[PDB]
Enzyme design. Structure first.
Site, PDB file in Angstrom:
ATOM      1  N   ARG A   1       0.830  -1.224   0.000  1.00 33.11           N
ATOM      2  CA  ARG A   1       0.000   0.000   0.000  1.00 33.11           C
ATOM      3  C   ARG A   1       0.869   1.282   0.000  1.00 33.11           C
ATOM      4  O   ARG A   1       0.395   2.383   0.411  1.00 33.11           O
ATOM      5  CB  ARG A   1      -0.991  -0.008   1.137  1.00 33.11           C
ATOM      6  CG  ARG A   1      -1.967  -1.157   1.161  1.00 33.11           C
ATOM      7  CD  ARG A   1      -2.951  -1.162   0.062  1.00 33.11           C
ATOM      8  NE  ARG A   1      -3.841  -2.320   0.078  1.00 33.11           N
ATOM      9  CZ  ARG A   1      -4.207  -3.065  -0.968  1.00 33.11           C
ATOM     10  NH1 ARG A   1      -3.783  -2.794  -2.192  1.00 33.11           N
ATOM     11  NH2 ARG A   1      -5.011  -4.105  -0.800  1.00 33.11           N
TER      12      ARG A   1
ATOM     13  N   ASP B   1      -1.079 -13.082  -0.953  1.00 32.26           N
ATOM     14  CA  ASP B   1      -1.904 -12.010  -1.483  1.00 32.26           C
ATOM     15  C   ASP B   1      -2.371 -11.110  -0.305  1.00 32.26           C
ATOM     16  O   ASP B   1      -3.553 -10.737  -0.205  1.00 32.26           O
ATOM     17  CB  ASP B   1      -3.078 -12.563  -2.273  1.00 32.26           C
ATOM     18  CG  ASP B   1      -3.959 -11.484  -2.834  1.00 32.26           C
ATOM     19  OD1 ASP B   1      -3.480 -10.379  -3.070  1.00 32.26           O
ATOM     20  OD2 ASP B   1      -5.183 -11.678  -3.016  1.00 32.26           O
TER      21      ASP B   1
ATOM     22  N   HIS C   1      -6.999  -3.792   3.838  1.00 29.10           N
ATOM     23  CA  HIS C   1      -8.226  -3.044   3.620  1.00 29.10           C
ATOM     24  C   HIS C   1      -8.818  -2.629   4.979  1.00 29.10           C
ATOM     25  O   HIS C   1      -8.752  -3.380   5.975  1.00 29.10           O
ATOM     26  CB  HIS C   1      -9.311  -3.858   2.940  1.00 29.10           C
ATOM     27  CG  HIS C   1      -8.960  -4.409   1.624  1.00 29.10           C
ATOM     28  ND1 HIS C   1      -8.775  -3.629   0.497  1.00 29.10           N
ATOM     29  CD2 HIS C   1      -8.751  -5.688   1.239  1.00 29.10           C
ATOM     30  CE1 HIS C   1      -8.472  -4.422  -0.519  1.00 29.10           C
ATOM     31  NE2 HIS C   1      -8.450  -5.671  -0.096  1.00 29.10           N
TER      32      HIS C   1
HETATM   33 ZN   LIG Z   1      -2.462  -8.900  -5.992  1.00 24.96          ZN
END
Ligand SMILES: [Zn+2]
Length: 369
Positions: free
Chosen positions: A65, A263, A267
Protein backbone atom coordinates in the site's frame (compact mmCIF):
# COMPACT_ATOMS: atom_id res chain seq x y z
CA UNK A 1 29.96 -11.70 17.63
CA UNK A 2 31.58 -13.01 14.46
CA UNK A 3 29.38 -16.10 14.26
CA UNK A 4 26.02 -17.64 14.98
CA UNK A 5 25.34 -21.26 15.86
CA UNK A 6 21.77 -22.38 15.49
CA UNK A 7 21.84 -25.46 17.75
CA UNK A 8 19.65 -28.49 18.47
CA UNK A 9 17.02 -27.91 15.76
CA UNK A 10 15.45 -30.16 13.16
CA UNK A 11 16.86 -28.74 9.98
CA UNK A 12 14.90 -29.10 6.72
CA UNK A 13 16.37 -27.88 3.40
CA UNK A 14 14.39 -29.44 0.55
CA UNK A 15 16.55 -27.85 -2.10
CA UNK A 16 19.34 -30.14 -0.93
CA UNK A 17 17.15 -33.12 0.11
CA UNK A 18 18.68 -32.43 3.52
CA UNK A 19 16.90 -33.07 6.78
CA UNK A 20 17.83 -34.11 10.28
CA UNK A 21 19.04 -33.10 13.74
CA UNK A 22 21.88 -30.82 12.79
CA UNK A 23 23.42 -27.52 13.85
CA UNK A 24 23.96 -24.61 11.50
CA UNK A 25 27.02 -22.32 11.65
CA UNK A 26 26.62 -18.85 10.10
CA UNK A 27 29.49 -16.45 9.43
CA UNK A 28 29.79 -13.33 7.29
CA UNK A 29 25.99 -13.43 6.77
CA UNK A 30 26.26 -16.79 4.96
CA UNK A 31 25.69 -20.49 5.70
CA UNK A 32 29.16 -21.84 6.62
CA UNK A 33 28.48 -25.38 7.82
CA UNK A 34 25.64 -27.82 8.66
CA UNK A 35 26.78 -30.65 10.91
CA UNK A 36 25.88 -32.40 14.14
CA UNK A 37 27.31 -30.83 17.32
CA UNK A 38 29.04 -27.59 16.24
CA UNK A 39 30.92 -25.46 18.75
CA UNK A 40 33.22 -22.58 17.81
CA UNK A 41 34.41 -19.52 19.79
CA UNK A 42 33.17 -15.94 19.31
CA UNK A 43 29.61 -17.09 18.51
CA UNK A 44 26.09 -16.35 19.52
CA UNK A 45 24.14 -19.56 20.09
CA UNK A 46 20.41 -19.87 19.33
CA UNK A 47 18.90 -22.86 21.02
CA UNK A 48 16.51 -24.29 18.41
CA UNK A 49 15.75 -27.47 20.44
CA UNK A 50 12.20 -28.60 19.55
CA UNK A 51 12.03 -26.18 16.64
CA UNK A 52 12.10 -26.56 12.89
CA UNK A 53 15.01 -24.73 11.20
CA UNK A 54 14.59 -24.01 7.48
CA UNK A 55 15.28 -21.42 4.77
CA UNK A 56 13.60 -18.12 5.24
CA UNK A 57 10.17 -17.93 3.68
CA UNK A 58 9.51 -16.04 0.48
CA UNK A 59 6.10 -14.46 -0.28
CA UNK A 60 5.74 -13.57 -3.95
CA UNK A 61 2.44 -11.68 -3.62
CA UNK A 62 2.13 -8.81 -1.16
CA UNK A 63 0.28 -5.45 -1.33
CA UNK A 64 2.26 -2.99 0.89
CA UNK A 65 0.00 0.00 0.00
CA UNK A 66 3.13 2.16 -0.32
CA UNK A 67 3.25 4.56 -1.94
CA UNK A 68 -0.24 6.03 -1.84
CA UNK A 69 -2.39 4.21 0.79
CA UNK A 70 0.08 4.15 3.70
CA UNK A 71 -2.76 4.40 6.28
CA UNK A 72 -3.73 0.82 5.36
CA UNK A 73 -0.11 -0.54 5.50
CA UNK A 74 3.39 0.68 4.66
CA UNK A 75 6.69 -0.85 3.86
CA UNK A 76 7.68 -0.80 7.53
CA UNK A 77 4.45 -2.33 8.89
CA UNK A 78 4.24 -4.96 6.17
CA UNK A 79 7.90 -5.86 6.70
CA UNK A 80 7.21 -6.23 10.43
CA UNK A 81 4.26 -8.61 9.65
CA UNK A 82 6.52 -10.44 7.16
CA UNK A 83 9.38 -11.18 9.58
CA UNK A 84 6.90 -12.06 12.34
CA UNK A 85 5.50 -14.59 9.92
CA UNK A 86 8.89 -16.10 8.96
CA UNK A 87 9.33 -14.22 5.62
CA UNK A 88 12.87 -12.97 4.84
CA UNK A 89 11.87 -11.95 1.27
CA UNK A 90 8.56 -10.46 0.03
CA UNK A 91 7.58 -9.33 -3.47
CA UNK A 92 5.38 -6.26 -3.54
CA UNK A 93 2.78 -5.66 -6.25
CA UNK A 94 2.92 -2.49 -8.43
CA UNK A 95 -0.67 -1.17 -7.88
CA UNK A 96 0.66 1.53 -5.64
CA UNK A 97 -0.01 5.20 -6.25
CA UNK A 98 1.94 6.20 -8.11
CA UNK A 99 2.27 2.72 -9.67
CA UNK A 100 5.64 1.01 -10.07
CA UNK A 101 6.13 1.95 -13.72
CA UNK A 102 9.29 4.07 -13.42
CA UNK A 103 12.68 3.91 -11.71
CA UNK A 104 11.81 6.73 -9.24
CA UNK A 105 9.12 4.55 -7.74
CA UNK A 106 11.37 1.50 -7.86
CA UNK A 107 14.15 3.37 -6.05
CA UNK A 108 11.66 4.61 -3.45
CA UNK A 109 10.71 1.08 -2.53
CA UNK A 110 14.35 -0.17 -2.50
CA UNK A 111 15.44 2.70 -0.24
CA UNK A 112 12.53 2.05 2.09
CA UNK A 113 13.41 -1.63 2.27
CA UNK A 114 17.00 -0.68 3.05
CA UNK A 115 16.08 1.80 5.82
CA UNK A 116 13.49 -0.52 7.39
CA UNK A 117 16.10 -3.32 7.28
CA UNK A 118 14.00 -6.38 8.17
CA UNK A 119 12.93 -8.46 5.09
CA UNK A 120 14.14 -7.99 1.59
CA UNK A 121 11.38 -6.19 -0.32
CA UNK A 122 11.57 -6.94 -4.05
CA UNK A 123 9.54 -4.71 -6.36
CA UNK A 124 7.65 -5.68 -9.48
CA UNK A 125 6.91 -3.46 -12.44
CA UNK A 126 3.61 -2.92 -14.22
CA UNK A 127 2.97 -4.67 -17.56
CA UNK A 128 1.61 -1.41 -19.07
CA UNK A 129 2.04 2.27 -18.43
CA UNK A 130 -0.10 3.37 -15.45
CA UNK A 131 -1.50 -0.18 -15.58
CA UNK A 132 -3.89 1.30 -18.15
CA UNK A 133 -3.62 -1.75 -20.43
CA UNK A 134 -2.68 0.20 -23.57
CA UNK A 135 1.13 0.74 -23.72
CA UNK A 136 3.79 -1.73 -22.59
CA UNK A 137 6.11 -0.48 -19.83
CA UNK A 138 9.91 -0.31 -20.12
CA UNK A 139 10.70 -3.77 -18.72
CA UNK A 140 14.43 -3.45 -19.47
CA UNK A 141 14.88 -0.28 -17.35
CA UNK A 142 12.56 -1.56 -14.61
CA UNK A 143 14.34 -4.86 -14.34
CA UNK A 144 17.80 -3.14 -14.31
CA UNK A 145 16.53 -0.95 -11.42
CA UNK A 146 15.47 -4.07 -9.52
CA UNK A 147 12.06 -5.32 -10.59
CA UNK A 148 11.84 -9.13 -10.43
CA UNK A 149 8.49 -9.66 -12.23
CA UNK A 150 5.78 -7.76 -14.17
CA UNK A 151 2.09 -7.54 -13.57
CA UNK A 152 -0.82 -5.15 -14.03
CA UNK A 153 -2.11 -6.68 -10.81
CA UNK A 154 -4.78 -4.64 -9.69
CA UNK A 155 -6.26 -5.43 -13.05
CA UNK A 156 -5.61 -8.56 -15.14
CA UNK A 157 -4.44 -8.07 -18.73
CA UNK A 158 -7.54 -8.13 -21.00
CA UNK A 159 -5.71 -7.47 -24.29
CA UNK A 160 -4.34 -10.79 -25.50
CA UNK A 161 -1.88 -8.91 -27.74
CA UNK A 162 -0.55 -7.01 -24.69
CA UNK A 163 -0.15 -10.30 -22.76
CA UNK A 164 1.75 -11.81 -25.74
CA UNK A 165 4.08 -8.81 -25.95
CA UNK A 166 4.60 -8.94 -22.17
CA UNK A 167 5.48 -12.65 -22.25
CA UNK A 168 7.74 -12.05 -25.24
CA UNK A 169 9.68 -9.44 -23.31
CA UNK A 170 9.62 -11.48 -20.14
CA UNK A 171 11.20 -14.38 -22.06
CA UNK A 172 14.12 -12.16 -23.26
CA UNK A 173 14.71 -10.95 -19.72
CA UNK A 174 14.32 -14.20 -17.79
CA UNK A 175 11.53 -12.94 -15.54
CA UNK A 176 7.90 -13.98 -14.99
CA UNK A 177 4.62 -12.28 -15.83
CA UNK A 178 2.20 -12.49 -12.98
CA UNK A 179 -1.45 -12.46 -13.97
CA UNK A 180 -4.98 -12.71 -12.68
CA UNK A 181 -5.16 -10.85 -9.34
CA UNK A 182 -8.10 -8.36 -9.14
CA UNK A 183 -6.78 -6.49 -6.07
CA UNK A 184 -7.92 -3.20 -7.66
CA UNK A 185 -11.59 -4.08 -6.90
CA UNK A 186 -10.54 -3.00 -3.52
CA UNK A 187 -7.54 -0.98 -3.44
CA UNK A 188 -9.41 1.45 -5.76
CA UNK A 189 -13.82 -16.22 -17.37
CA UNK A 190 -11.07 -17.36 -15.05
CA UNK A 191 -10.54 -20.65 -16.93
CA UNK A 192 -10.44 -18.97 -20.32
CA UNK A 193 -7.91 -16.39 -19.12
CA UNK A 194 -5.68 -19.13 -17.65
CA UNK A 195 -5.90 -21.19 -20.82
CA UNK A 196 -5.01 -18.05 -22.80
CA UNK A 197 -1.97 -17.44 -20.57
CA UNK A 198 -0.83 -21.06 -20.89
CA UNK A 199 -1.09 -20.87 -24.66
CA UNK A 200 0.84 -17.60 -24.90
CA UNK A 201 3.45 -18.85 -22.46
CA UNK A 202 4.03 -21.88 -24.65
CA UNK A 203 4.08 -19.84 -27.82
CA UNK A 204 6.56 -17.22 -26.47
CA UNK A 205 8.66 -19.33 -24.05
CA UNK A 206 7.83 -16.83 -21.35
CA UNK A 207 7.02 -17.77 -17.78
CA UNK A 208 3.50 -16.93 -16.62
CA UNK A 209 2.51 -17.11 -12.95
CA UNK A 210 -1.23 -17.36 -12.16
CA UNK A 211 -1.92 -15.31 -9.02
CA UNK A 212 -5.42 -16.58 -8.30
CA UNK A 213 -7.05 -19.88 -9.11
CA UNK A 214 -10.47 -20.96 -7.79
CA UNK A 215 -11.90 -23.91 -9.71
CA UNK A 216 -11.04 -27.50 -10.26
CA UNK A 217 -11.01 -26.89 -14.00
CA UNK A 218 -8.48 -23.99 -13.70
CA UNK A 219 -6.23 -26.37 -11.73
CA UNK A 220 -6.64 -29.13 -14.30
CA UNK A 221 -5.72 -26.70 -17.10
CA UNK A 222 -2.65 -25.55 -15.21
CA UNK A 223 -1.49 -29.15 -14.58
CA UNK A 224 -2.04 -29.92 -18.30
CA UNK A 225 0.19 -27.07 -19.38
CA UNK A 226 2.83 -28.00 -16.80
CA UNK A 227 2.82 -31.62 -18.00
CA UNK A 228 3.49 -30.38 -21.55
CA UNK A 229 6.54 -28.35 -20.43
CA UNK A 230 4.95 -24.93 -20.39
CA UNK A 231 6.53 -22.51 -17.85
CA UNK A 232 3.38 -21.88 -15.87
CA UNK A 233 3.09 -21.72 -12.08
CA UNK A 234 0.44 -20.82 -9.62
CA UNK A 235 -0.10 -20.02 -5.94
CA UNK A 236 -2.69 -20.19 -3.22
CA UNK A 237 -3.26 -18.23 0.00
CA UNK A 238 -3.13 -20.80 2.88
CA UNK A 239 -5.13 -18.32 4.98
CA UNK A 240 -8.11 -18.76 2.58
CA UNK A 241 -8.18 -22.57 2.80
CA UNK A 242 -8.91 -22.36 6.61
CA UNK A 243 -13.74 -20.27 -4.35
CA UNK A 244 -14.09 -24.11 -4.27
CA UNK A 245 -11.91 -24.67 -1.21
CA UNK A 246 -11.86 -28.42 -1.72
CA UNK A 247 -10.54 -28.38 -5.27
CA UNK A 248 -7.82 -25.97 -4.12
CA UNK A 249 -6.87 -28.33 -1.29
CA UNK A 250 -6.67 -31.21 -3.77
CA UNK A 251 -4.49 -28.96 -5.96
CA UNK A 252 -2.07 -28.42 -3.07
CA UNK A 253 -2.15 -32.15 -2.25
CA UNK A 254 -1.31 -33.13 -5.85
CA UNK A 255 1.43 -30.54 -6.39
CA UNK A 256 -0.43 -28.48 -9.00
CA UNK A 257 -0.14 -25.41 -6.78
CA UNK A 258 3.55 -24.43 -6.66
CA UNK A 259 3.62 -22.13 -3.62
CA UNK A 260 1.80 -20.46 -0.83
CA UNK A 261 1.69 -16.72 -1.39
CA UNK A 262 -0.52 -14.62 0.84
CA UNK A 263 -1.90 -12.01 -1.48
CA UNK A 264 -1.62 -9.93 1.74
CA UNK A 265 -4.23 -7.30 0.87
CA UNK A 266 -4.78 -4.62 3.54
CA UNK A 267 -8.23 -3.04 3.62
CA UNK A 268 -10.05 -0.97 6.24
CA UNK A 269 -13.77 -1.09 5.42
CA UNK A 270 -8.72 -9.70 0.09
CA UNK A 271 -7.33 -10.31 3.55
CA UNK A 272 -4.11 -9.69 5.43
CA UNK A 273 -2.05 -12.80 5.85
CA UNK A 274 1.73 -12.49 6.22
CA UNK A 275 1.58 -12.86 9.93
CA UNK A 276 -0.74 -15.96 9.82
CA UNK A 277 0.39 -17.82 6.68
CA UNK A 278 2.40 -20.42 8.59
CA UNK A 279 -0.24 -21.61 11.06
CA UNK A 280 -2.74 -21.67 8.19
CA UNK A 281 -0.49 -23.89 6.08
CA UNK A 282 0.22 -26.13 9.13
CA UNK A 283 -3.43 -26.97 9.38
CA UNK A 284 -3.03 -28.71 5.99
CA UNK A 285 -0.02 -30.57 7.41
CA UNK A 286 -1.86 -31.64 10.55
CA UNK A 287 -4.70 -32.95 8.39
CA UNK A 288 -2.33 -35.15 6.35
CA UNK A 289 -2.77 -33.16 3.14
CA UNK A 290 0.93 -32.31 2.89
CA UNK A 291 4.17 -33.40 4.54
CA UNK A 292 6.17 -30.87 6.56
CA UNK A 293 8.89 -31.01 3.90
CA UNK A 294 6.33 -30.10 1.21
CA UNK A 295 5.04 -27.23 3.34
CA UNK A 296 8.59 -25.90 3.53
CA UNK A 297 9.09 -26.33 -0.24
CA UNK A 298 5.98 -24.27 -0.88
CA UNK A 299 7.26 -21.37 1.29
CA UNK A 300 10.96 -21.51 0.18
CA UNK A 301 12.58 -23.11 -2.82
CA UNK A 302 9.38 -23.21 -4.92
CA UNK A 303 8.71 -19.44 -4.76
CA UNK A 304 12.45 -18.76 -5.10
CA UNK A 305 12.41 -20.66 -8.40
CA UNK A 306 9.33 -18.85 -9.65
CA UNK A 307 11.06 -15.41 -9.28
CA UNK A 308 14.56 -16.72 -10.19
CA UNK A 309 16.40 -15.74 -7.04
CA UNK A 310 19.13 -17.80 -5.37
CA UNK A 311 17.25 -17.91 -2.04
CA UNK A 312 15.05 -20.55 -0.36
CA UNK A 313 18.02 -22.82 0.44
CA UNK A 314 20.56 -23.43 3.23
CA UNK A 315 23.31 -24.32 0.76
CA UNK A 316 26.85 -23.55 1.92
CA UNK A 317 27.71 -20.00 0.97
CA UNK A 318 24.15 -18.78 0.49
CA UNK A 319 22.71 -15.85 2.43
CA UNK A 320 21.82 -16.89 5.96
CA UNK A 321 18.12 -16.28 5.59
CA UNK A 322 16.72 -18.74 8.15
CA UNK A 323 13.29 -19.27 9.78
CA UNK A 324 12.96 -21.09 13.06
CA UNK A 325 9.45 -22.17 14.03
CA UNK A 326 7.39 -24.23 16.41
CA UNK A 327 4.66 -26.18 14.56
CA UNK A 328 2.63 -26.63 17.74
CA UNK A 329 2.79 -23.19 19.44
CA UNK A 330 -0.73 -21.76 19.86
CA UNK A 331 -1.38 -18.02 19.66
CA UNK A 332 -4.01 -15.56 18.49
CA UNK A 333 -3.88 -12.67 16.06
CA UNK A 334 -5.37 -9.85 17.96
CA UNK A 335 -4.61 -6.42 19.40
CA UNK A 336 -1.77 -7.92 21.39
CA UNK A 337 0.01 -9.47 18.44
CA UNK A 338 -1.10 -7.68 15.23
CA UNK A 339 1.70 -5.76 13.40
CA UNK A 340 -0.51 -4.70 10.41
CA UNK A 341 -2.17 -1.29 10.20
CA UNK A 342 -5.24 -3.26 9.09
CA UNK A 343 -7.19 -6.16 10.66
CA UNK A 344 -9.02 -7.61 7.67
CA UNK A 345 -8.89 -11.35 8.14
CA UNK A 346 -11.41 -14.01 9.28
CA UNK A 347 -8.62 -15.37 11.47
CA UNK A 348 -8.89 -12.35 13.77
CA UNK A 349 -9.27 -13.57 17.32
CA UNK A 350 -9.06 -17.29 16.39
CA UNK A 351 -6.67 -19.84 17.98
CA UNK A 352 -3.82 -20.54 15.55
CA UNK A 353 -1.33 -23.37 15.89
CA UNK A 354 2.21 -22.90 14.63
CA UNK A 355 4.43 -19.85 15.30
CA UNK A 356 7.73 -18.43 14.14
CA UNK A 357 10.19 -18.12 17.00
CA UNK A 358 13.16 -16.52 15.14
CA UNK A 359 13.70 -15.01 11.66
CA UNK A 360 17.29 -14.39 10.58
CA UNK A 361 18.14 -12.29 7.52
CA UNK A 362 21.77 -12.32 6.23
CA UNK A 363 22.78 -13.77 9.62
CA UNK A 364 21.06 -11.05 11.68
CA UNK A 365 18.10 -11.74 13.90
CA UNK A 366 15.28 -9.56 12.54
CA UNK A 367 12.49 -11.24 14.51
CA UNK A 368 12.26 -13.01 17.86
CA UNK A 369 9.00 -14.21 19.59
ZN1 LIG B 1 -2.46 -8.90 -5.99
Amino acid sequence: MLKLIVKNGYVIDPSQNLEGEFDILVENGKIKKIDKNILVPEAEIIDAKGLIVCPGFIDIHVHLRDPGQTYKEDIESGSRCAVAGGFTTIVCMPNTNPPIDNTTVVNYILQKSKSVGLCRVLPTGTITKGRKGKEIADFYSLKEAGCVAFTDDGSPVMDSSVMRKALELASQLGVPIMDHCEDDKLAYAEEIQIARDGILAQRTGGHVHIQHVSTKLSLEIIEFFKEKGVKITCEVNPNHLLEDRLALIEGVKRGIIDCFATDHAPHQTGIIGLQTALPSALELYRKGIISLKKLIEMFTINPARIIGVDLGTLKLGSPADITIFDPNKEWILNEETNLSKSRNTPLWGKVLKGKVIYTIKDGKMVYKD
